[PDB]
Structure formats: C-alpha cells, structure tokens
Design a protein around this ligand. Structure first.
Ligand SMILES: [Cl-]
Ligand SMILES: [Cl-]
Lengths: 149, 188, 156, 149, 156, 190, 188, 190
C-alpha cells in the first residue's frame, strides 16, 4: 500500500537525508571559496561575484533541480565546487528517475492519489512563502512608521 | 553586531562540539535486533551494543568490528570500509576540528590584531561538517554490509553537522566584515 | 473488433485527467503567488519601476518554463519568491519524472475495445505545434494592425 | 545487427525529418513574430529584442537540445511560439529517451561500437566549424587588405 | 562465493571504459576547438578585450556544463562557435540518454564471481563530492596565501 | 481604468463566492453507480448521494464518510484523509476566505484611506484559491480510496478557483497602483 | 542589395511553387507493393497508383481513398484523417499560398508605396510552409493506417517547404529594410 | 614569458610527434589471446601481432585485416570501417599534421614576420588531435568487430592527442598575443 509520499520511494531515507546534508555543505563551501578572500572584494565594498550564502544556496538548489539560475561561478575553486555538484546531481537525479521508472513498471495511468503528497507540499510552500512575504512587509512597515514618527 | 555575532559563533561552536562529543560517546546510534552476549531488541553506538530487553537487558558488549565467522574475509574494499568504520576516524576528526575551531575563536578573542584566526576557525568548522558527512555515510554503508531505526545519538551528530556549517558561515562572514572595516579605515 | 491505435492526444495518457486539471490549477496558483510575493510590497519598488521583473505575465512565463524544464531569462531573488520557485521546482521534478517514465509505452498501446516510434504516434504533438505557430502569427498580425490603426489616428 | 547510427533507432526516419522541418518552421515563425513589426524597432535602428533569424535558430536548437540559451522571447506571440516549442520538445525528447531505454533493455555495458556514429558526427562538426571560421578569417583579411591598398 | 556488491565507482558501469576515455578526449577537443574558433581571429577583438568571453578556461567550463545538462552564463554567438556548441549538444543528448537509461539497474547488480536505492550504492558519488569540496577549499586557500605573500612583498 | 478595475474585482469576487457556495451546497459533484437506500447510477456531492432514474429517483442518502469494518487505526494518514474529507474543511474555508475578501472589498470602498484593506482582500482571494485546490485534491483522493463522471458542482468549484485567482491578481494590481499613486504624489509634493 | 534580394525572393518563390505543383501532380510519392488493377512493385502519388513491373506495368489506377473491404469502417478520428488525406487539402493549400505570395511579390513591383504587400508575401510563404508540414504529416500518418520508400515527388514537396521558409524569411527581411529606410527618411 | 611559451610549444610539438610516431610504429597496442603462426597471449599493434611467452616468443605475424569468408559486400559500412582500419589513415594523418605543425613552428621562428604561420601551426595541432581521436575510435570499433588489455603504444597515442591539443592552445595564444601587440603598437603610433 503506497502512501501519499510514495514518490520518495526510489531512494532510501538515508539517501534523502545525505542529499540535504550534501546540499548544505556544497552551498557553504561555494560561499566560502567565493567570498572569504579580501582580494575578491573591490571598491562596505562590493564583491566581484554574486555568490553570497543565500545566492549559493539558490545556485545549488537550481543545479540539483535541473533548472539553473542567473549566476555561475567564475573562479577556479567555485567552478570546482560547481562541477562536482553537477556530477553528483547528474548521478543522483538519473538514478532517481531510473528507479522511479522501475517502480512504476512493476501501461496504467498514474492517479492523483499517488501525487497528492507533492501537491500538498506545493500548496504548503506557497502558504509559507506568502506568510514570509507578509512578515517582511509588516516589519518594513513598522520600521517606516518608527522612522517617520 | 560584532559582539552579537561573536556570541552566536561561540555558542554555536560549543553546542556543535558538545553534540558531536555526546554522539560519539553514547550508545544510541541504531536500534536493531541482535545479541549482546559474546535476536532481541538492542541499541548500538559506535563501539558497543547494549540490550534493551530480555534476560541480558542492560548488558553492553563491544562491537565485533571484524566478524570472522559471519563473513570469513572479503575483498580489500570491504576491508578498508570496515577499518574506517571501526576506527571511527571521521567522527573523531570532526570532534577534533570543532575543538580546534573553538580554540581559534578564543585565540582571536584575545588576539584581535590577527584576522586570519577567524578564517582558520571558519575553515575548521566547515571541515568538521564535511568530516561529519563522511562519517555518517561510512557508518550507514558499514551497517548495510527486519526493521532498524536511528537513535538520538545519530541525530545529535546530524544536528552537530548543521550547527557546524552555520557557525562556519558566521565565522566567514565575521572575517569578511573585519576585512571590510580594515579596508574602510585604510581608505580614509 | 480491429485493434485500436492510441488517440491523437495520446501524450496525455500517462497521467490521469484529474492530475492534468490539478497541474493546470497548481500552475495558475504558483504563478499568482509568485507575482504577489514579488510585486505587492511598496518596498520592492524604486514612472516608479519595480526592483524585479516578476509581473503576472512574467511570473506565468517563468512558471511555464520551470515546468517545461527549459528556464527563462529571469529568476526570483527574494526569499518568498525563491521559496515559491524551489517548491515549484520540486513539484516539477516529481511530476515530470512520473510523466516521462513510460511516455513511449503509453504512445503505442493497442487496446482491444521494442520498435521505433512512428510519426502516427506523435502526429498530435506536431498538429499542436503548427496550430500554436498559426495562433502566434495571428496574434502578432492583430497587434500590428492595432498599432497601425492607432498610429494612423495619431498622425491625422 | 545495429549500425553505427543505431542511436537514431528509437524514432522512425519520418519523425526525424519532421523534427527538422518543425525546427525550421518554429525558428522562422519566431523570427517573423519578433522582428516584422516596425513598432518593435526603436532608434538602421535596433530592435527591442535579439531574435533575429540566426538567434531564433539558436534559441530553437538550444530549447530542443535541453540546454537553453542567453535570450528568451518577451512578447505574447514570441512566447506562444516558445511555449508550444517547449511542449513539443518535452514530448519528443521524453519519448525518445523512453524508447531508447526500451531499446537498450531487449545490465550489459554499452560499447564504443554503438556510439561511434555520434563520435564521428561530433568530429565532423568540429572540422566544419574550424573550416567556417578559417573561411571567415580569410574573407575578413582580404577585405582588410583591399581596404588598406 | 558470497554475492559481490557493486564497487564505489559503479556509476561508471553503464558505459565501457573506452567510451569514458573517448568522452574525456572529445570534451577536451570540443573545448579547444570552441576556444580556437572564438578567439583566434583579430576581428573578434576590440588592453584590447575580446568581443566574446570564450577563453580556454571559459570554453572548458561551458563544455562541462553542456555535458552535465546544466548550462552556464555564456553562450557562443558566432557561426563556428554555435556549430561547435550544437554538435556538442547533440553528442551530449545521445551519450547522456544512453548513460542514464539504466543507471539504477547498473548501481544494484550483484555478480557471482524493485527496491529502493541504498546509500551504499551512491556512497562513491558522495565521497567524490566531499573530495571535490576539500580540493576546492585547498585551492582557494592556496590562492589566498599566494596573494597575501604578493601583497606583503608589495607594501614592504 | 480604475473604476473598471474596481467593478471587475467586485463582480468577480461575488461570482467566485456564489460559485463556491453553490458547489458546497449542491450534490452534483460525482456521477457514479451506488445505492441511495440507507447498484444504480447516482449523483453525489460533499454530503449526500441521490439516485437518478430507476425506481428510487429523488431519494437522497447521507454519505457514510467512515466505511469498512474492524475499526483498525494502525494507519493515521487514511484516518486523517477521511476526517478532512468528511468535514469538508477546505471547501468551507475557501468559501469563508472568499467572503472575507468580499468584506475587505466593501470596507475599502468605504474607508478609502487604508490601502492595506485591498492587500488583505487579495491575500484572502489567493488563499481561497489555494484552499479550493487542497479541497479538490482531498475530494478526489478520498473518492479513489468502476466508471464515474464529474457533475456541474465540481466544475463550479473549479471555476470559482480560477475566478478567485484572477480577482486576487486584480486586487494586488489595485494595491500596487494605489501605492504608486501615493508615492508619485509624495515625490511631487517634495 | 534591394534588387538582388528581390531577384532571390522571386526566383525562390517560383522554384518553390513549381516544386510543390510538380509534387502534387506527379505519382512518385511512395514506392510500395500493391495491385494497380481494380503484390508487385508500384509507385504511388496523391491520387493514383501505377505499376512498375509485371503484366500490368504502366497502368495507373485511382487510389481507393475509402477502402470499404479492407477496413469496413472505423471511428470518426480515422474517418476525418482519411478525408483530409483524400481531399489533399493541405498540399493544395500550400500551392495556393505559394501562388498568392508570388502574386504579392509581383504586385509590389508597381505598388512601391504599399509596404504591406511584402509583409503579406512573407506571411503567405510561411503559411505555405506550415501547410506543407501538415500535409506531409497527414500523408505519412494515412499511409501507416514489407519495405516502402519515398520517391522524388515527396522530396520535391520537402524542398518546396524549405525554399518557402527561406523566401518567407527573405521577404520579412525586405519588409524590415523598407521600414528602416522609411524611418530613416522620416528622421531627416 | 614569451620565450617560455615558445619553448613549451616547441617541446610539446616535438614530444607529441615522437609519441604518435612511436605509437604508429610499435605493436604494443593490444594484449589479447591469438596465434602468431601464419591461442596464446599476444601483443598486437596497427600492423603486426606477436606472441609473448609460450614456445613462439618473438614471432610476429601481419594482421589479417580482411578476415571471414564468403566475401559478401552487401553492407558497405563494415567494408569502409575495415579499409579505414587497415590503412590506418587517421593515425598516419595525425603524424603528418603534427609534423606540418612543427614545420610551421620552425618557419615562424625563422621568418618572424608572417604571424599566420603560428595560426597554421595551431590549426595543424588541433587537426592532428582530432585525427588521433578518429583513429582511436576506428581502432577500437574494428577490434570489437574474450579478455584484452591496452599496451603502452595505445596510451602513447592518447598522450600524443592530449599534448597536441595543449600545444594547439598555446600556439593560438601566441598568435593572439602577436596580433594584440601589433594592434597596440599600431594604435600607439597613431
Ligand atoms: Cl451534498
Ligand atoms: Cl604493428
């Protein structure tokens, strides 16, 4: 009896947890090798690259999700990080898709009961994003109000 | 604030070091069925396995890291993996790197002139997280080579990795801010 | 009692019709939420242009590109917009993998009601492509005619 | 006995020919809807978009090859063309990959004899590109020489 | 006579070793040819910067991104560069499809010498990732030390 | 165009609320075989199933949202899904959020100074659409857990979702325009 | 040059129209095995099939577009496809659009003020190519619903599509250049 | 750094030419079981196969590039591949192109005025690498058409390809630098 989160079945739980840990580590290392050097900062000044921690996380997520982003590392170390993350992502995503095809070939059309979990995740993410945006707006409005008072 | 960032870095470094030290020292990495003498429910750590129930409840036995009768030897890859898991080199290395990062944080606390100490602390925290990742992967792989569950020591190690990564990011940001202030004062 | 070939729209076979309806609804919802969290706040505005390019049309275009595994020339930069983008990316990965698992098998099923794919199995895709090209040409020509009429009224 | 161009087997020859024709038609229509209007040209003037015929062909090829490019249509008609080409590409590429997975499972490692054709195509393309670049360089050099004489 | 699990580098199993060697050689050749057709002509140059960004390092980066189905921030604009890019894209499509057809099956083959994938089947990928991260940190630190020594020689 | 936008927003809000309320109230959601006695073609909604044609035409029976015997609670996901479907919490929440958005529209038409009311209405309409999506998914999943069809109440709910999303977009546009006009006036006066 | 571009457009339009007219009119679209009376090698076009060998060589028979005995009716989708293939609506539409584009190109010779004639010609050529694509897909699909080969009449239609697309691009470019010259004069 | 680049280019060109020539000449390409009499472990190259160990150690036999009987030419791809492998046209072409590139290096070092000679040398080196790739693929495909290994001549060819590509990159860099210096001098004098 497959559950509502049966789309995670092709990979073991340990694989997903280690994917999260690897994503965090790669984002942190990319940010470090992109921003730690004072010689990458040119005239708080502005860095020669856009790879802050938030942007590093965004780049890593876009690379893993087969989507890409608006920036790409330019330095040798940043490109080493990006290339090794690309290799890891290619292997992991290809393995997931192959094992998912195997799981679905155990031609019957897929039912909504098998993807309801991903729909729930999507709607929860939309709600969380709306809440975060509203919290930021309220904070900025309070800052403006205390500024103008 | 520089003081607030320093306090957060120190607190996180101490928390990560304590979490990893507890994870390495405790015996609740895994909940699996087994024998704690010489198929009952047991909890196992990195060195010894202890029983939860039965006539041998509460008795812990050192883990046979090289089971001779169970496998009668194997190739060199499995032997190397077993040796790496038995030595627990990577969890202990993560503990050592977290301790070195904390020592660097303190040194920079009373060596304000030297700015590369903060960078060393950040590198130490990032490397400790990476060593944690390698140790986790090695432990899970060596377990594989019937329901099992992961105890609170495993998640203590995972949280230690997360906190180490966060503290490394904070230390790198502090290094960048110190160099920013230095260059701003040098400009004018 | 002859064997029945798959229909012209057999590319929709791998997913149920409820899944397709919910995919359309989720696409609309994600585009609307992305536009909302990108544009609603006055602090994201500089006659007064916006910091980002994520209007409703651009949000729809970005969401369609993300679902189609293609990408576009813009990407969300704010935390709320990036949450929407990431969750939509995860949804797209899951749904597209499930859809493309057995597409070729679904395109050649004969129903009683390894060979190469034939053109008859993808003729519907080709028809939709040419229809979209014709619709785009019609829309462009209509817009050109409208601007021509407006300019003729302007210069007279 | 699969040939050296057996990687084209999952799709019939008519599918490949119609793919080429569809690619040409989509590129031409994208260029037409992007550039024909005098109201898209702002002050030879410069267009509001970069979708000339050569760039339209490049965009269509990048979209079909699952790679992307540096530009994306912004107008309604151009975006209709792009979206319908995206739908076509998704269906066709997914069908090709699924039928290829079926063809390769009639676990034995793939041999170089089965991809030698794609290697030959790649090296021929590299040679053609080098020849085109050299021809352009020679033409520009002759133009410079007759300019300076 | 125990069942032998796949090795750490079992992700290379779907392709023969000759194919991998030829893939590396073709990657190098395509990068070199792309750099050549992008940079050799003086008419592609404006102290005198180039019209494009396709140096040898950037060409290698673009080729690696294209093979890895990722993309980068640059794209060839000239006819010869676009021919190189298109043929490399076709090669990548064919090779990557063939490689990823049965990756999961190749990762769980027991040899006498549908279950979820285990972490033991992808531990090699994880090891390579962490090794690359460590190498990148080492390279960045070495570069920082070199610039520090140069600056110390400069201001003394 | 401000008045046209305001009128379109008001009309769309009312239409979406009416469509969602009718869909929740009526029982022409599913056309399937069943029994209305407490195997003939029936029509069922969120609460009641009624036979059409046959001998028991017009007889309605309350849907037993907790079927099957042996009352085992080993799995909590199924119990949660059945409870959520039985309560119809998400369609009713969508109706409530649409009503709140309409109330915000009406209040903004009266206060005319607090621009945040338009933003609140837009948030309410977007959330109503999201709740409608969740309710549709829950309803279809519960139905899955044999030919069938969807009646006009289901498509009324679908159209309500679409119109709610459109009205939310229009309300956000109105809020943006109000703040842009305010900023332009402030800059001009400065 | 404007004159050179006009000459290329006229030559290409005439070539595409002639190629498509020959393709529609000739009987070498497909080489397959069949009977030309009322399993020998035959060549078939859009309307009739003719024999290449045997005692019936040289005798062509009109194609039975609705084979009653071979299929004894089918659903409405197959019937619609068969009717579309039988009428040959799309190849003839492509011929008509190519003729209209050629007429527009010729009409603009003595109507230099009206720049929309060039645009109309370009739209006509692009639409003729699209109609060619649809006709090709319909023909191949209707053939499917044992070795067969495509003759020179089929490739005549393919080349007509390619030339029509090229001529449409050239016409659009000429329209853009005419508007460029007009706006340049308007600036002065 | 101009002299260092020139010396590296010359040394790499010579090394690549020597490695390719040795690989073409020698017969330690493949280690496989066979017979050197006109099933023992042997070593074979592009022309000859020779047994190692056993009783016929050191005996070499010319490779029968046209095996199999019945001499049917229905398929032309197999015949073309067999002829290309037998002639070894692509390894020899790679050797010739490397020699031509080295000659261009020498002529440029002597002429010192025609900058196009450096570009021609770079083109020659890149083409030699491409020809080496084609030859390797053809050789492996012909071998495919049973344990085996690759000897040091095969890896000599591989290293020759790598070095030829590197030297081509260096030559293109030198051509770019020469033209950049020329343009800078022309702009300064203007
Ligand atoms: Cl009801
Ligand atoms: Cl030899």
């Amino acid at each position: 009896k497959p559950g509502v989160f049966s789309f995670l079945d092709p990979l073991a739980y340990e694989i997903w947890m280690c994917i999260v840990f690897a994503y965090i580590g790669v984002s942190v290392v990319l940010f470090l090798v992109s921003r730690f050097s004072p010689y990458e900062w040119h005239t708080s000044s502005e860095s020669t690259n856009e790879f802050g921690i938030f942007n590093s996380l965004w780049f890593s997520l876009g690379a893993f999700m087969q989507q890409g982003c608006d920036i790409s590392p330019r330095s040798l170390s940043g490109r080493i990080v990006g290339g090794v993350w690309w290799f890891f992502t290619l292997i992991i995503i290809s393995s997931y898709t192959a094992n998912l095809a195997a799981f679905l070939t155990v031609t019957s059309a897929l039912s909504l009961s098998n993807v309801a979990g991903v729909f729930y995740i999507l709607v929860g993410g939309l709600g969380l994003a709306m809440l975060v945006a509203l919290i930021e707006f309220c904070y900025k409005s309070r800052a403006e109000a205390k500024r103008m008072k | 604030d520089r003081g607030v960032q320093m306090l957060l870095t120190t607190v996180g470094a101490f928390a990560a070091f304590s979490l990893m030290t507890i994870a390495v020292g405790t015996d609740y990495w895994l909940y699996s069925r087994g024998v704690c003498k010489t198929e009952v429910m047991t909890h196992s750590g990195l060195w010894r396995t202890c029983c939860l129930e039965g006539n041998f409840k509460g008795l812990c036995k050192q883990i046979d890291h090289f089971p001779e009768d169970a496998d009668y030897e194997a190739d060199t890859a499995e032997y190397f993996l077993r040796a790496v898991r038995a030595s627990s080199i990577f969890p202990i290395l993560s503990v050592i790197l977290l301790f070195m990062g904390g020592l660097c944080i303190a040194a920079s606390e009373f060596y304000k002139t030297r700015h590369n100490i903060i960078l060393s602390a950040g590198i130490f925290f990032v490397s400790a997280g990476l060593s944690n990742i390698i140790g986790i992967i090695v432990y899970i792989s060596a377990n594989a080579g019937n329901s099992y569950s992961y105890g609170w020591s495993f998640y203590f190690g995972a949280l230690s990795f997360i906190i180490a990564e966060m503290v490394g990011v904070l230390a790198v940001h502090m290094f960048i801010d110190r160099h920013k202030q230095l260059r701003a004062t040098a400009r004018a």
